[PDB]
Amino acid sequence: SKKIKDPDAAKPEDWDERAKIDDPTDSKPEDWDKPEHIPDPDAKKPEDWDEEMDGEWEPPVIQNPEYKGEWKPRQIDNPDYKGTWIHPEIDNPEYSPDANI
Known part of the structure; x- marks a missing residue:
């Protein structure tokens, strides 16, 4: 879809950005x-x-x-996290409206 998490967006290397995890052992x-x-x-x-x-x-x-x-799935509040600053998503290059980008 349009607007996704990306590298331009200047994220740190994985600083417990989630708040709420997904399927732990289910999937x-x-x-x-x-x-x-x-x-x-x-x-x-x-x-x-x-x-x-x-x-x-x-x-x-x-x-x-x-x-x-x-x-x-079941986005449950994690076992303690940091605090997603506010990453600016960017205009997903791989989105493609009707013609590949």
């Missing part, structure tokens, strides 16, 4: 992580459209029934 795959938005399966476009002049159509999305806000 599962990523396969919770279903897409928030899926295109309409029956997303037909108008024949009254010129993608030459718009640039593309505009295929609608719906919210997926399986929608979880993110793979947050």
Whole structure:
């Protein structure tokens, strides 16, 4: 996604930045992580459209029934930490809106 943790952002080398840990001994795959938005399966476009002049159509999305806000397992408060200063995230180079960066 847009805006992620990165090296430009000038983080120290691992200074108990978390506050709340994730699955200690549990863990599962990523396969919770279903897409928030899926295109309409029956997303037909108008024949009254010129993608030459718009640039593309505009295929609608719906919210997926399986929608979880993110793979947050059980973010439990850790066994004592430091204090995440406020790292400035940066504009995730590997995001790519529609064309690879």
